[PDB]
Amino acid sequence: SAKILCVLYDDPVDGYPKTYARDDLPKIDHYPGGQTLPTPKAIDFTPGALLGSVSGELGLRKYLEANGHTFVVTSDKDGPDSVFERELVDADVVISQPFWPAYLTPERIAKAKNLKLALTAGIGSDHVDLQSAIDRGITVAEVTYCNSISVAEHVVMMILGLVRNYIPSHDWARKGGWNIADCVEHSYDLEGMTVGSVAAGRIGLAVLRRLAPFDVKLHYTDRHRLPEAVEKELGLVWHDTREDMYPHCDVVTLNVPLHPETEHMINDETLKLFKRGAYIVNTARGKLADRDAIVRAIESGQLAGYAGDVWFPQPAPKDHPWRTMKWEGMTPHISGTSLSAQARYAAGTREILECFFEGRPIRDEYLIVQ
Amino acid sequence: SAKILCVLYDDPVDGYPKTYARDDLPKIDHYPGGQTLPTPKAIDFTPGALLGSVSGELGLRKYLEANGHTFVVTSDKDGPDSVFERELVDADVVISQPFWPAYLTPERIAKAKNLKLALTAGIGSDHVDLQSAIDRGITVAEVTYCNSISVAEHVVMMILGLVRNYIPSHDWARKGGWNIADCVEHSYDLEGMTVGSVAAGRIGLAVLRRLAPFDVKLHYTDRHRLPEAVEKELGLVWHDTREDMYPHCDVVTLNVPLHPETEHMINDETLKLFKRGAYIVNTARGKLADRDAIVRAIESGQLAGYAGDVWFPQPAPKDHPWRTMKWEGMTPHISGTSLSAQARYAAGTREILECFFEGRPIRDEYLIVQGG
Ligand code: NA
Ligand code: NA
Ligand code: NA
């Protein structure tokens, strides 16, 4: 009855795996704060499978095709002559992940005569023009909270790796070296350091909770201030402005969206507020940081480390300078598409498709516009 | 009137640093449990300096030479014709680190005609034959707790690195790729897994404490059970034996010393007790794990990852199989010699020498063998 158009990233270069490292995933009832994890009526995958690549199909093909539907899955999403744009003109449902996002521009939404549901397998909607969606009666939905914890682990990983000098030290072991002084001449303990978070939110609070037993001093800024009880339980020190926070911090982690007042918020002028040898971890948006200002800060020693999984442009060009600068701890944009996060937003994708196709309401927390 | 012989590791291959990444170190009041940090009357370094290499000299030379002493610093420590063994003959004090250890065998101790104090700039005395020092009246001392937290951070770092597939994902980024599916085909969240610790002394307990806000389940075993209040604060599950613990664990961190009964305690037979796709982190001793048994379990998928900073043999030979095996997260032996830890055991080394040379008692908690 319906045509479903689903954009996913490519399979591994060796091919889609047949077996995985483990047999299942740890059970979890809820997210911090009580939101229950996705609750489809069933799933047709084993949790832990690769669901976000083209062959994983978010485990939706059996359920969709048993019910008469057409299911189109592709990674060709860019430009007007992509499989996505061409297939889009009679698609009823569009599904993509933020890690390989199918943009629903105003022009593309106007091309899509049949579009009814725009589904983010993942979190957020800024690949969708919401006004155009509202004007066309298109519902936009997301699997809220599905990877906030995944990102938060990635951050703490990266903070430890930068402070302790993990990546270069590992390079000496893999290369057949030893070179103890070479490893540790840039290696510190995190204990006693001051970590500052720009924005709490789901990711920022999870990061702070996870840093707390490392005996760091915890500072943060946000637009609104955490409840007094949360601040006292975690020893949080509040700042009205990030510029007031920066001079206190050995580590600064960024958790804000990209807006006109956050674009290039880390630049040559604001980096002068940071302690010599400060560390920055950025899992939010690549353009929070002036690309070349970061390179210059690493080169001068204003920063002793930079790490994150977001770039600009994204995907990063092959010669993007953050790839090979000193004291980098980068990964590709992956933190929110760990296999654990995939199981949850695949499950949430199916749950929304079920509510949608059966005419039942979609969870309020999932709905962006309707 | 004293000769202090000090073995340290080589300087970095691009020279002793003139500039450091940062100007200072965080102040730390005490260790968990209440032990005070080292209390030398003075230090002649700025904390954060590279102290454990030949040119750092643990910041000791000005202090020793101003007091009429002879201070010999070398990295040449192995073999009968090395600088260490040739200078040992009349050394009053021997100082080395476990990261480049000057071995005080019975033979060398028999040849060290004036040896009164064997000082570990670090923790332990594995490289010192204690019966020979006891027989000879030689004081053996260490800088207790100086890097227990440093090891604990390295463990949690490495658990997160293994589970989330950090090292291959960073490789994709550094080589100019992107390859999201290649990164995440072996990437998981830690959240909700079961982590088991073999022993819960200073390191293991500090690991368990740092793991708790990751919402993992925390199991442990030890020769001596933790106090009930400690178990209840962290919700620890106690196991009578290592073998009772392994089947429950997604991640196993080894924090036990090397002994006859722990040697090769991870082996082809006990690995069959682990869950398929378990992860092992080992910052304790390389020979806790049968070298090739771990490689076989990686190739089998019995383990989804192995990481640590200790090796057998140590230093690891160029073609040590853990260097290039799949899903490895290794570093050289470095966790307990971060610059922060260096500052503390350099400070503690000076504190001990000051007590020693002034004929004042050395801290009980520093003494492995009292001597005189
Ligand atoms: Na500080
Ligand atoms: Na790929
Ligand atoms: Na003293």
Indicate whether B174 and B133 sit together in one domain: no
Q: Which domain holds residue A22?
A: 3-147+337-369
A71 bridge partner residues: A4
Indicate whether A163 and A283 sit together in one domain: yes
Indicate whether A173 and A53 sit together in one domain: no
Tell me, in angstroms, the distance from the centre of ligand 1 to residue A163's CA.
13
Place of tokens 């009980």: B364
Residue A328 lies in a domain: no
Indicate whether B107 and B177 sit together in one domain: no
Residue B95 lies in a domain: yes
B154 flagged as catalytic: no
B285 flagged as catalytic: yes
Which residues in chain B touch residue A213, judged by CB atoms under 8 angstroms apart? Answer: 209-210, 212-213
Of the partner residues A188, A319, A337, the one whose CB lies closest to the CB of residue B180 = A337
Indicate whether A182 and A68 sit together in one domain: no
Kindly state whether B299 is in contact with chain A, defined as any CB-CB distance less than 8 angstroms.
no
Q: Which one of A53, A155, A175, A191 makes the best mutation probe of the B interface by having the most chain B beta carbons within 10 Å?
A: A191
Q: What is the CATH number of the domain that holds A209?
A: 3.40.50.720
Residue B280 lies in a domain: yes
What is the identity of the amino acid at B103? Answer: Y
Indicate whether B169 and B239 sit together in one domain: yes
Q: Taking CA B326 as the corner, what is the angle to CA B321 and CA B329, rounded to the nearest 5 degrees?
A: 80
Residue A331 lies in a domain: no
Kindly state whether A176 is in contact with chain B, defined as any CB-CB distance less than 8 angstroms.
yes
Q: Which one of B14, B18, B180, B300 makes the best mutation probe of the A interface by having the most chain A beta carbons within 10 Å?
A: B180
B264 flagged as catalytic: no
Of the residues A97, A147, A282, A342, only one is catalytic, namely: A147
Residue B127 lies in a domain: yes
Indicate whether A125 and A194 sit together in one domain: no
Cα-based distances in Å from A195 to A87, A107, A167: 47, 44, 21
Residue B79 lies in a domain: yes
Q: Do you find a cis peptide bond into B47, omega within 30 degrees of 0?
A: no
Q: Which of A286, A301, A323 is the last residue of a domain?
A: A323
**Resolution of the solved structure (Å):** 2.1
Q: How far is it, in rounded angstroms, from Cα A48 to Cα A23?
A: 7
Residue B123 lies in a domain: yes
Kindly state whether B235 is in contact with chain A, defined as any CB-CB distance less than 8 angstroms.
no
Indicate whether B156 and B81 sit together in one domain: no
Which residues in chain B touch residue A154, judged by CB atoms under 8 angstroms apart? Answer: 164
Indicate whether B354 and B282 sit together in one domain: no
Indicate whether A138 and A166 sit together in one domain: no
Number of domains in chain B: 2
Place of tokens 């940090």: B37
Nearest ligand atom owner, CA of A53: 2
Kindly state whether B326 is in contact with chain A, defined as any CB-CB distance less than 8 angstroms.
no
SS (H, E, C) chain A: CCEEEEECECCCCCCCCCCCCCCCCCCCCECCCCCECCCCCCCCCCCCCCCCECCCHHHCHHHHHHCCCEEEEECCCCCCCCHHHHHHCCCCEEEEECCECCCECHHHHHHCCCCCEEEECCCCCCCECHHHHHHCCCEEEECCCCCHHHHHHHHHHHHHHHHHCHHHHHHHHHCCCCCHHHHHCCCCCCCCCEEEEECCHHHHHHHHHHHHHHCCEEEEECCCCCCHHHHHHCCEEEECCHHHHHHHCCEEEECCCCCCCCCCCECCCHHHHCCCCEEEEECCCHHHECHHHHHHHHHHCCEEEEEECCCCCCCCCCCCHHHCCCCECCCCCCHHHCHHHHHHHHHHHHHHHHHHHCCCCCCHHHEEEC
Residue B115 lies in a domain: yes
Indicate whether B313 and B286 sit together in one domain: yes
Q: Which has the closest alpha carbon to B74: B19, B23, B8?
A: B8
Indicate whether A236 and A343 sit together in one domain: no
Tell me how the structure was determined: X-ray
Residues 54-83, chain B: which have Cβ within 8 Å of A?
Answer: none
